Amino acid sequence: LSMWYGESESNIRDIFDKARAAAPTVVFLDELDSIAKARGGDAGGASDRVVNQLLTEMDGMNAKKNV
Amino acid sequence: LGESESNIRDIFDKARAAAPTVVFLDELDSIAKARGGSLGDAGGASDRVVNQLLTEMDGMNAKKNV
Amino acid sequence: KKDNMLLVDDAINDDNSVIAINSNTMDKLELFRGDTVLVKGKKRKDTVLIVLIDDELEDGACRINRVVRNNLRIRLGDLVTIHPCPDIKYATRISVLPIADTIEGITGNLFDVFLKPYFVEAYRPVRKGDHFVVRGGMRQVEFKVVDVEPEEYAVVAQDTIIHWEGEPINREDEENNMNEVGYDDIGGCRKQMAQIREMVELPLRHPQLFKAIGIKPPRGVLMYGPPGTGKTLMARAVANETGAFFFLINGPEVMSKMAGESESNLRKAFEEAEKNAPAIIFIDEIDSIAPKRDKTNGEVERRVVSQLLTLMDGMKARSNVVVIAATNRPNSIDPALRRFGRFDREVDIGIPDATGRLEVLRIHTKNMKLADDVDLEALAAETHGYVGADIASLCSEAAMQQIREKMDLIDLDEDEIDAEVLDSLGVTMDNFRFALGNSVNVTWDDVGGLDEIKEELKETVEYPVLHPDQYTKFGLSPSKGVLFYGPPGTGKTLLAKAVATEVSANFISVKGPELLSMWYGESESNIRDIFDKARAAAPTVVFLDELDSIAKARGGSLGDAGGASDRVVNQLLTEMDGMNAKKNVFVIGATNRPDQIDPAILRPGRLDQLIYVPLPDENARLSILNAQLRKTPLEPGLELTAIAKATQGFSGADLLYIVQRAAKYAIKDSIYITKEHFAEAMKTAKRSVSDAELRRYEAYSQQMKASRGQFSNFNF
Amino acid sequence: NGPEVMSGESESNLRKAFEEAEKNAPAIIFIDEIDSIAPKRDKTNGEVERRVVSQLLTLMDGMKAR
Ligand SMILES: Nc1ncnc2c1ncn2[C@@H]1O[C@H](COP(=O)(O)OP(=O)(O)O)[C@@H](O)[C@H]1O
Ligand SMILES: Nc1ncnc2c1ncn2[C@@H]1O[C@H](COP(=O)(O)OP(=O)(O)O)[C@@H](O)[C@H]1O
Numbered sequence: 041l042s043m044w045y046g047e048s049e050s051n052i053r054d055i056f057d058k059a060r061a062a063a064p065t066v067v068f069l070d071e072l073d074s075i076a077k078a079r080g081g082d083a084g085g086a087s088d089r090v091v092n093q094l095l096t097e098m099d100g101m102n103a104k105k106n107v
Numbered sequence: 108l109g110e111s112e113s114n115i116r117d118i119f120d121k122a123r124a125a126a127p128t129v130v131f132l133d134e135l136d137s138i139a140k141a142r143g144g145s146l147g148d149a150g151g152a153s154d155r156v157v158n159q160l161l162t163e164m165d166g167m168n169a170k171k172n173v
Numbered sequence: 174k175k176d177n178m179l180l181v182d183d184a185i186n187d188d189n190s191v192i193a194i195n196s197n198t199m200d201k202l203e204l205f206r207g208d209t210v211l212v213k214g215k216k217r218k219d220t221v222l223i224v225l226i227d228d229e230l231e232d233g234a235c236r237i238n239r240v241v242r243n244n245l246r247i248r249l250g251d252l253v254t255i256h257p258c259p260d261i262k263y264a265t266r267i268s269v270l271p272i273a274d275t276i277e278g279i280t281g282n283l284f285d286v287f288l289k290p291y292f293v294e295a296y297r298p299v300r301k302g303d304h305f306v307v308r309g310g311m312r313q314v315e316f317k318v319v320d321v322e323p324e325e326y327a328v329v330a331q332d333t334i335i336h337w338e339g340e341p342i343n344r345e346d347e348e349n350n351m352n353e354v355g356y357d358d359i360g361g362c363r364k365q366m367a368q369i370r371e372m373v374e375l376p377l378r379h380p381q382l383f384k385a386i387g388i389k390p391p392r393g394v395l396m397y398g399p400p401g402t403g404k405t406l407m408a409r410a411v412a413n414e415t416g417a418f419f420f421l422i423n424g425p426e427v428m429s430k431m432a433g434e435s436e437s438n439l440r441k442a443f444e445e446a447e448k449n450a451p452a453i454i455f456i457d458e459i460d461s462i463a464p465k466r467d468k469t470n471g472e473v474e475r476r477v478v479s480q481l482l483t484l485m486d487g488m489k490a491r492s493n494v495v496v497i498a499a500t501n502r503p504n505s506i507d508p509a510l511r512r513f514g515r516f517d518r519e520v521d522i523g524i525p526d527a528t529g530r531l532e533v534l535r536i537h538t539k540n541m542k543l544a545d546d547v548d549l550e551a552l553a554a555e556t557h558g559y560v561g562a563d564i565a566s567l568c569s570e571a572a573m574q575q576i577r578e579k580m581d582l583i584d585l586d587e588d589e590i591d592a593e594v595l596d597s598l599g600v601t602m603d604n605f606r607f608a609l610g611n612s613v614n615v616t617w618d619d620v621g622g623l624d625e626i627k628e629e630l631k632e633t634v635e636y637p638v639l640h641p642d643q644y645t646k647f648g649l650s651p652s653k654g655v656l657f658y659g660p661p662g663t664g665k666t667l668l669a670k671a672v673a674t675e676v677s678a679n680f681i682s683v684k685g686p687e688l689l690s691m692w693y694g695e696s697e698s699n700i701r702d703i704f705d706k707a708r709a710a711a712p713t714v715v716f717l718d719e720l721d722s723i724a725k726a727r728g729g730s731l732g733d734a735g736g737a738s739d740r741v742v743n744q745l746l747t748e749m750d751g752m753n754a755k756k757n758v759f760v761i762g763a764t765n766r767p768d769q770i771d772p773a774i775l776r777p778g779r780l781d782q783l784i785y786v787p788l789p790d791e792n793a794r795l796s797i798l799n800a801q802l803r804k805t806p807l808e809p810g811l812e813l814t815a816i817a818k819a820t821q822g823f824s825g826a827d828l829l830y831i832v833q834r835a836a837k838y839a840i841k842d843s844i845y846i847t848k849e850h851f852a853e854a855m856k857t858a859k860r861s862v863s864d865a866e867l868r869r870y871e872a873y874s875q876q877m878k879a880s881r882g883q884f885s886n887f888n889f
Numbered sequence: 890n891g892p893e894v895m896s897g898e899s900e901s902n903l904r905k906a907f908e909e910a911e912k913n914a915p916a917i918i919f920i921d922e923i924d925s926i927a928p929k930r931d932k933t934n935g936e937v938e939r940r941v942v943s944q945l946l947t948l949m950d951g952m953k954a955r
Contacts, residue, residue, distance in 0.1 A: 079108065081692065109690075146734070151691045158687040345955050352953065426943060430934040 041090070048086060049093040056097045063105040111152060112159040119163045119173075126171045176201050178254045180234030181247050185227060189305050190297040192255075193227035193236035201232060204257060209298040209328065211258040212237075214245030216350065217416070221261065221298035221326050244303050246351065261298065261326050264333035268320035270341025272304070275315040284337050287314050292329045300326040304347070317343040354410045359403065360536050361529020361561070365520050366407055369394060372518070373411050373495065377451070392495045393485075395516040397503035399709075401562030402522050405455060408497045412453040420446050424458030428477065435473060436480040443484045451493040460500045463507055478507060485515040524560055524710045527553050527677050533561055537568050543599045552605055557677045558612070558710065571608040575600045613670045613680060620664060620671045621797030621825075622789050629784070630655065630672040634759065638676050638712060653755070654780035656720070656762040659870055660862050662826030663786050665763040669716045678712040678759070685719025689737070696737065697744040704748040704758075711757035721766035724774055742771060749779045767873065785874055788824070788867070791817045797825060801832050806845035816851060822867075827859050891925035899937065900944045907948050 042048045059067050069075065075094065077087050101107065108114075122128050132138065142157045144150070167173055176198075186193055192212065194204070204210065204224050213219045220241055230236055235255065237245075247253060271283060287307040291297075299305070303318040319341070321327045329335070359366055376383060376390045383390055396404040405421075412419035422442055429435050446452050462481075464474045484490065498516060500506065510516055525533065531553040556564070575598075583594055620627065637644065637651040644651065657665040666682070673680045681703060688699045707713045717723065727742045729735070749760060762780055764770070774780050789797060794817040816831075831854055838850035894902050910918050920926070926945065928938050 082110070109695075148691045151689065154686050155690070158684060162684060162687060345953065348953060348955065425930065426939060429936055429939070431936065434936065 041086075049089055052090070052093050052097060059107050060105050063107065065107055067107060108152070108156070112155055115156065115159045115163060122173050123171045126173065128173055130173060176232075177256060178252055181242055181245075181249055181251050181253060182230070182234045182236045183249060184236045184238040184242075185229060186225060186236070187238060189238065189240050189291075190222050190295070190299070191238070192222040192224055192241065193230050194224050195228065195230035195232045196226050198230070198232035199226060208257055209259070209261065210255055211261075211326070212241065212245060212253055212255055214247045214253040215251065216246040216353075218244065218246055218302065219300060219326070220244045220303060221258070221300050223298065240304070240306050244300070258326070261328060262323060263296070263330040264299075264327035265322035266334040266336060267299065267318065267322075267327070267329060269305075269316040269318050269335070269337050270343055271337070271339075272315045272317060272341075272343040274344075275313065279310070279312070283314065283339070284335065286310060288316070288335055288337055292333075292335060294331060296328050296330045296333075298326065298328050304343070315343075317341070317347075319343075353413045354406060355414060356410060358536055359407055359410055360532030361525030362403060362407060362522055363529075365522055369407065369411060369520065373417075373453070374415055376493075377415050377417075391517045392491060393514065393516045393518060394495070394497045395503065395506075395511065395519045396497065396499050396522055397501070397519065398522045399524060399560055400501055401560040402524070403561050404499050404522050405457065407522070408453065408455045412455075415453075416450070418446070418450055418452035420452060420454055422454065422456045424456075424461040428462055428473070430473070432473065433476075435477050439477060439480050439484065447492060447494055454494065454496040455499070456496065457499045459498045459510075460502060460505050463505065463510060465505060465507060478510075482507070482509055482515070485510075486512075526711075530556065530559065530561075530564070533564050534568075537565050541572060541599065544601050547600070547602055547605070551602075554677050555609060558679045567605075567608050570611060571600045571604045574607055574611075575604045613674060615667070615670050615674050617671055617675060618803065619800055620667050621800040622793030623664070623668070623786065626668070626784060626786065627671070629782075630668065631675075633782070634672050634676060634714070637757075638678070650755070652781060653758060653778075654749075654760045654762070655782040655784060656764075656767075656775070656780040657784055657786050658764055658767040658873075659786045660788060660824065660866060661765050662824035662861065663788070664825050665786060666716070666718075667825075668786070669714070669761050669763065672761075673714045673716075676712060676714070678714050678757075679707075679710055680714060680716065681707055682716040683718070685717075685722035688723075689741070696741050700741065700744050700748060708753075708756060708758055712759065713757065714759035714761060717760060717762050718764075720762045720764040720774070721769045722764075724770050726769045726771040728771075742773075746773055746779075749774070750776075783877065785870075785877075787874075788822065788862075791820065794820055794823070794828065797828055798832075801829065808845045808847060811846070811848050811851060816855065819855065822862070823858070823860060824862060827861065830859060831855065891920070891922035894926065894941065895937070899941045903941065903944050903948055911952075 042051065056067075059065050076091060079088060079091075082088070119130070122130050138160070139157055140153050142150075142154045145153060179198075184193070192210065199205075206223075206225055208224050209221055210224050211219060211221055222237070222241055227236060235253075242248070245253060269288065276283070287309055290309075291305075291307045299318050299321065301318055301321055304315055305318070307314050307316070316337070327333075356366070356370070372391060372394075396408075398404065409419055411417075420442065422439075427435055427438050427442075429438075443454070446454050462474065462477050464471075464478075466475050466478060469475065485496065496515075503511075503519065506516070511519070531549055534549050534552055556567070559567070579598075583591070617627075633652055633655070657668070659665075669682070670680070683703055688703075689696050690699075703715070707715050723745070724742055725738050727735075727739050730738065760780065762774075767783075775783070795813060798813045798817060820828075831851075834854040834857070835846060835850045838854065839846050842850070896902075906918065910916050926938075927942055928935075930939065930942060933939070
C-alpha cells in the first residue's frame with residue numbers, strides 16, 4: 041500500500057507480473073485481513089480498489105503459468 | 108453491501124437503462140431478512156436496504172418491463 | 174420627444190437607396206429631395222439613403238423598402254433614429270460580392286448586367302456591410318458591400334471605381350450577427366435581468382451620471398441556483414447587447430496539475446480581458462476552484478484562490494471590467510471572495526414560475542409554425558418541475574419526433590425534394606404528450622368516494638395558489654398542514670396525488686424509515702435537504718409518510734435511538750414552523766397510529782387539519798369500482814352492485830386486488846371482461862383489516878369528537 | 890483518426906479539418922477512436938489534451954445552419 045495515486049495497485053500489478061514471469065511460483069499472501077478487508081462511509085475507496093485489483097489480477101489464471 | 112443504497116439504486120438504473128432485462132437476485136434471505144426489529148447498526152442497514160429495494164421495485168410501471 | 178426618431182413603414186418607392194419622408198416632416202427638420210441621410214437602427218447598424226417627399230408617409234414614421242429595412246435589422250413597426258450626413262463624399266472604389274445562392278445557375282459578366290446599370294448616374298449612397306438587390310435577367314441577385322475606400326460609407330458617382338469579384342464571402346457573417354442572443358430571448362428572470370441590465374449598461378451608456386454622483390459602480394455579480402437556469406445565457410445576452418467582449422472561463426478546464434500553470438492561465442485570461450476593451454468576464458463553476466482554504470489539502474487550489482483574490486482586488490487591479498460567476502451551492506465560496514469589490518452582488522436565479530415557463534415556451538417555439546389548436550396552458554401547467562434548460566430539449570424532441578413519425582411513407586429526399594410535404598408541417602398536442610412521456614398520472618377521477626374530504630382538500634390547496642391578491646387584501650396567511658389517519662389500504666397516497674395533480678406544484682413523496690441512518694446527523698441532514706428541495710421550488714406539496722415511525726411521541730427513551738428520535742423530532746419541528754419564511758410549503762402527513770404522535774407537530778400551524786379517512790360503504794365502493802374500471806372493455810351482463818353488496822368491510826387495496834385478479838384471468842383467457850372471472854375471483858378475497866383496529870379507530874374518533882365540547886351555533 | 894492530430898498545431902489541424910469540411914460541400918466527418926482525443930478531462934493531467942478538447946468543443950459548437 042502507498043499514499044500516492046496508482047502505486048497502491050501498481051505494487052500488486054508488478055508483484056503479480058513477477059509471479060507470472062517466474063513460473064511456477066508460490067505467492068504467500070500473509071495476513072489477508074488487511075488486503076482482503078470486508079467492505080461494509082469510507083476513506084475514499086482505496087481498499088475497494090485494492091480488492092478489485094486483486095480480483096481482476098487473480099481471475100486471469102488459466103491452465104498456463106500455473107501460479 | 109449511503110453507498111449500500113446507492114449500489115441497489117444504480118443496479119436498478121442499469122436494469123432500467125437496458126430494457127428489457129432480468130435481475131436474478133440470488134439468495135434473497137441474506138438481503139431482506141424480514142426487517143422487523145433487530146435494534147442495531149446491522150438492523151438499520153437491513154431496514155435501509157429493504158426500503159431501497161421496495162421503493163425501487165414498486166415504481167415499475169408497464170413501461171421498462173424489468 | 175425629439176422629432177428625430179421615426180418608425181419603419183411599408184415602402185411606396187421601390188428603389189433600393191431611398192426613404193420617404195412627408196413634407197410636414199421636412200419643415201420640422203430641414204432636409205431635401207437630393208439629401209443623403211444616415212439611418213442608424215438597432216443592433217448598432219447603419220445605412221445611407223435618399224430622402225424624398227411623400228404625401229402618404231405621414232410625419233411620425235418613414236417608408237423604407239425591405240432591403241434598407243434588412244440592413245438595419247429592423248421590421249415594419251420598429252423605431253429608428255434618422256440624421257443627415259453630408260460629410261460623406263464621392264467614392265474612390267467599392268467592393269461588392271454576390272451571395273452564392275442568388276447566383277447559383279448563371280455565370281459571366283455580373284458587372285455589365287447588374288452592377289453597371291444599377292449604380293449608373295444614380296450616385297447611390299452605399300455603406301460597408303450593406304446587402305443590396307438588383308433585378309435583371311429573370312432573377313434578382315444580392316451583393317454585399319465588403320469594402321469602400323472613403324471610410325464606412327460613400328457615394329457611387331460615375332467616376333467611382335466598382336470592383337466586383339466572383340468567389341465572394343457573404344450571408345454567413347451576417348447570420349452570426351442576427352443569430353446573436355438578446356433581451357427578447359430571456360423569460361422568467363425579469364427583475365434580476367433588469368437589475369443586471371441596469372448595473373451593466375448604466376456605466377456603459379453614460380458615465381457622466383456616475384461622474385456627477387461621484388461614486389464607482391459595482392463590478393461583480395455572483396449568480397447561484399440550480400444548473401440549467403439560464404445564467405450564462407443572461408450573461409451572454411448582456412455581453413451581446415452592450416459593446417463588451419464575452420470571454421468564457423471554465424472551472425475544471427483551467428485547473429491543472431502543473432505548478433504555477435493554472436495561475437498563469439488566469440493571469441493570461443485577465444490580461445486578455447483587460448487588454449482589448451472594457452469586457453465581461455464569465456468564470457463558470459467557481460465552487461470547484463474555491464475550496465474555502467481550510468477543507469482542502471492541495472496547494473494549487475489555495476494558489477489559484479490567492480491568484481483570483483490578487484487579480485480581483487489590489488493595486489491597479491481592474492480598469493473598467495466586470496466579472497460574473499456561476500455556482501450551484503454559494504456557501505462553499507471564500508468570505509474574501511464574497512466581499513465587496515469582487516462578488517459584491519449575489520443574484521438568486523431560481524426556478525421560474527408558470528408565467529415565466531410560458532414565456533420560455535413562447536420564445537422557444539418562435540422559429541417554427543407549430544399548429545393552430547395547441548394550447549400552452551397545459552404545457553405550462555403539466556411541466557411543473559422543469560428548470561428551463563429541459564424545455565428547449567422538450568421542444569426539440571417533439572419537433573424531431575413529428576418529422577420522424579411523418580417520414581415513414583413519404584421519401585427522405587433521395588431523388589428530389591417535394592412541394593406539398595413542406596406545407597402543413599408542425600407539432601401537435603400528441604407530439605408534446607409523447608415528449609412529456611419521454612410526476613404521477615391522475616386527475617381528480619381515480620379516487621372514489623370521500624366527497625367532503627375532496628372538497629376540503631381542493632379548497633385548502635387550490636385557494637392559496639389561485640388567489641394571492643385576495644389574501645393580501647384580507648392580510649392573512651393560509652393553512653398548510655393536513656394529517657390523515659385510519660386503516661391501511663384506504664387511499665391516503667391517492668388522495669395526496671389527486672390533490673397535488675391539479676395545481677402547478679411538484680410532488681416530493683418520501684418514506685418514514687428510508688431517511689434514518691446509523692451515523693450522527695444524517696437523518697436530520699436528509700430532513701433539511703428534503704425541506705430545502707421543497708422550498709426551493711414554489712409551490713411544492715410534501716408527503717411525509719409514517720409519522721408514527723418518524724415522531725414516535727418522543728418523551729423519554731434514555732438511549733442512542735431515543736436521542737436520535739429527539740433530534741429528528743426537533744429538526745422536523747424547526748423545519749416545519751421555526752425561523753423560516755413559509756413561502757409555499759404544503760406538508761401532508763399520512764399515518765396509521767395517531768396515538769404515538771407528540772403534541773407539538775399536531776399543534777396548529779403545522780398539521781392542524783386532523784382529517785379522518787373512514788372505511789367506504791357500499792355506495793362508496795360502487796364509485797370505487799366505477800373509478801377503477803374507467804378504460805376497460807365492459808360486459809352489459811355484469812352487475813357491480815352485486816359485487817359491492819358482498820364486500821362487508823373491504824378496502825381499496827382488496828378491490829384493486831380483485832380487479833387485478835379479474836384482469837389476470839382476462840389475459841389468461843385471451844392468451845371484454847366476462848362475468849365468470851369476477852365470479853371466481855370474488856371467492857378468493859383477503860380482508861386484511863381485522864376488527865379490533867376498527868374499534869380502536871372508532872374510539873379515537875369518538876374521543877376526538879368528545880374533545881370538541883361546549884361548541885354550538887355561538888350567537889354573539 | 891484519434892492520435893493522428895498531434896505534432897500549437899493540433900488546434901490548427903482541427904481548424905483545418907473543420908474549415909475543409911465546411912468549405913467544400915455539406916458533407917460528413919468521421920472521427921474514429923475519440924477516446925484518445927477526449928481523455929474524460931478529470932483523470933487526465935496534461936495541458937495539450939485540455940487545449941485540444943477545448944478546441945473540439947468550440948469547433949463543434951461553432952457550426953451554423955449554412
Ligand atoms: N430564460 C430562458 N429563456 C430562453 N431560453 C432559456 C432560458 N433559460 C435557459 N434557456 C435554454 O437553456 C439552455 C441552457 O441554458 P444556458 O444558460 O446556455 O446554460 P445553463 O444550462 O448553464 O443554464 C440554453 O440553450 C437556452 O436556450
Ligand atoms: N377510494 C378509492 N378509490 C379507488 N382506489 C382506491 C381507493 N382507496 C384505495 N384505493 C386503491 O388502494 C391502493 C392503496 O394504496 P396506498 O394508497 O399506497 O395505501 P394506503 O391507502 O394505505 O395509503 C391504491 O393503489 C388505490 O389504487
